[PDB]
Amino acid sequence: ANIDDLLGDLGGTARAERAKLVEWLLEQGITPDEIRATNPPLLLATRHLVGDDGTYVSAREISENYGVDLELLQRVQRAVGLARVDDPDAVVHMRADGEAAARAQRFVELGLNPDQVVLVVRVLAEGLSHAAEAMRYTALEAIMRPGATELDIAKGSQALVSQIVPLLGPMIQDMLFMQLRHMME
Amino acid sequence: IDDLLGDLGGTARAERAKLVEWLLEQGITPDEIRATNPPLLLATRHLVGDDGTYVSAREISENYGVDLELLQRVQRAVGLARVDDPDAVVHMRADGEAAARAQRFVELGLNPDQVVLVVRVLAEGLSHAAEAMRYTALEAIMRPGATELDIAKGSQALVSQIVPLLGPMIQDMLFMQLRHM
Ligand SMILES: CCCCCCCC/C=C/CCCCCCCC(=O)O
Numbered sequence: 028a029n030i031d032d033l034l035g036d037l038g039g040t041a042r043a044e045r046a047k048l049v050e051w052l053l054e055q056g057i058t059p060d061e062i063r064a065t066n067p068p069l070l071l072a073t074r075h076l077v078g079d080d081g082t083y084v085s086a087r088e089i090s091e092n093y094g095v096d097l098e099l100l101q102r103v104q105r106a107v108g109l110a111r112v113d114d115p116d117a118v119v120h121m122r123a124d125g126e127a128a129a130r131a132q133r134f135v136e137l138g139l140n141p142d143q144v145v146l147v148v149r150v151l152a153e154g155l156s157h158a159a160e161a162m163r164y165t166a167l168e169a170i171m172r173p174g175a176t177e178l179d180i181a182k183g184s185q186a187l188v189s190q191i192v193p194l195l196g197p198m199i200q201d202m203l204f205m206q207l208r209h210m211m212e
Numbered sequence: 213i214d215d216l217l218g219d220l221g222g223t224a225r226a227e228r229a230k231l232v233e234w235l236l237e238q239g240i241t242p243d244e245i246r247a248t249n250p251p252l253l254l255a256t257r258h259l260v261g262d263d264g265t266y267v268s269a270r271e272i273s274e275n276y277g278v279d280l281e282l283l284q285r286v287q288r289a290v291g292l293a294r295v296d297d298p299d300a301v302v303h304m305r306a307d308g309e310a311a312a313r314a315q316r317f318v319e320l321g322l323n324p325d326q327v328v329l330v331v332r333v334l335a336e337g338l339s340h341a342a343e344a345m346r347y348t349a350l351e352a353i354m355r356p357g358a359t360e361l362d363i364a365k366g367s368q369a370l371v372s373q374i375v376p377l378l379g380p381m382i383q384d385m386l387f388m389q390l391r392h393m
């Protein structure tokens with residue numbers, strides 16, 4: 028009788044399909060608060076495969092956890108452009124997003140200009156946002172079968188994306204270094 | 213090393229002589245120095261995976277057991293070699309290994325047309341990022357009155373310290389975008 032709050036006003040076949048999906052999501056460790064916050068909730072367990080762990084942090088918490096400067100960390104979060112509360116105490120950043128932003132500081136410690144490092148973050152994130160869009164369409168084309176229910180799609184994504192994830196990191200690293208070789212050549 | 217100094221005179225010749233001397237003792241060959249103009253970044257290129265080895269697409273396909281036709285589609289999408297001959301030895305070795313990664317995504321059921329388009333868009337975005345990175349690195353390395361040798365040594369030192377950070381950073385940035393797509 029809990030899932031009723033999570034089904035809201037849905038009626039008919041849509042309601043029954045959502046109920047099956049929600050049951051499965053809760054089984055994958057997805058929380059009711061996550062489900063309520065994501066419309067539609069179909070791919071939430073797939074979002075966990077790419078580093079969402081259901082936990083959120085503030086910029087201050089990130090700065091104290093990794094021992095990095097709060098003001099530089101906030102410049103980097105702005106350049107990425109995915110967060111939208113700039114309060115250093117707002118608990119709004121996915122944990123893994125904070126860890127990524129915390130990597131900028133070491134580049135500055137090694138003597139790179141912070142203004143230039145922040146511009147590089149902006150440019151990298153803009154390029155990758157376009158690549159991730161194309162990846163989305165590519166993944167959905169494989170997963171979205173004719174007549175598939177919401178639960179069908181969620182389970183199909185779980186199986187396929189789990190196999191893709193270990194290939195992605197090494198691939199993008201290799202693609203970066205290919206570019207670095209050719210700007211030197 | 214006169215053959216390696218060519219037409220240079222004056223201060224330019226003097227600076228180049230010092231650079232060539234340092235390069236030769238880092239293990240760079242006269243052949244390689246001769247082939248690269250300016251030779252300033254020869255002792256930094258290995259740090260990003262350019263060891264001077266080249267391969268053909270047919271060789272990559274045989275050595276990694278991947279489809280030659282798909283591999284060439286991927287090489288076109290990255291668009292870095294003036295080449296379309298499967299037997300031309302014109303691909304940097306590491307670039308060929310990178311292109312061989314596409315096969316598994318297709319084996320998993322992703323549409324090869326879409327996989328090729330993803331490669332095209334990723335390479336385009338990374339080419340811009342790589343330009344920005346070049347500028348950032350040069351700002352750090354170039355001092356006033358810096359000689360060729362000073363720049364080569366400063367580049368080697370800084371690139372050696374930065375390369376270990378780059379891979380993990382770019383992987384993290386990709387997954388950050390995937391979480392929000
Ligand atoms: C040679 C380069 C090959 C490029 C490979 C193309 C990548 C294929 C697409 C990757 C799918 C990853 C999608 C992750 C889905 C996340 C959805 C979510 O956050 O809920």
Ligand SMILES: CCCCCCCC/C=C\CCCCCCCC(=O)O
Nearest residue numbers: 131134147148345346348349367374
């Ligand atoms: C997202 C966190 C911010 C990190 C930004 C990374 C900045 C890296 C910039 C410099 C490293 C590039 C290494 C190769 C540069 C070429 C060296 C040369 O000029 O010969």
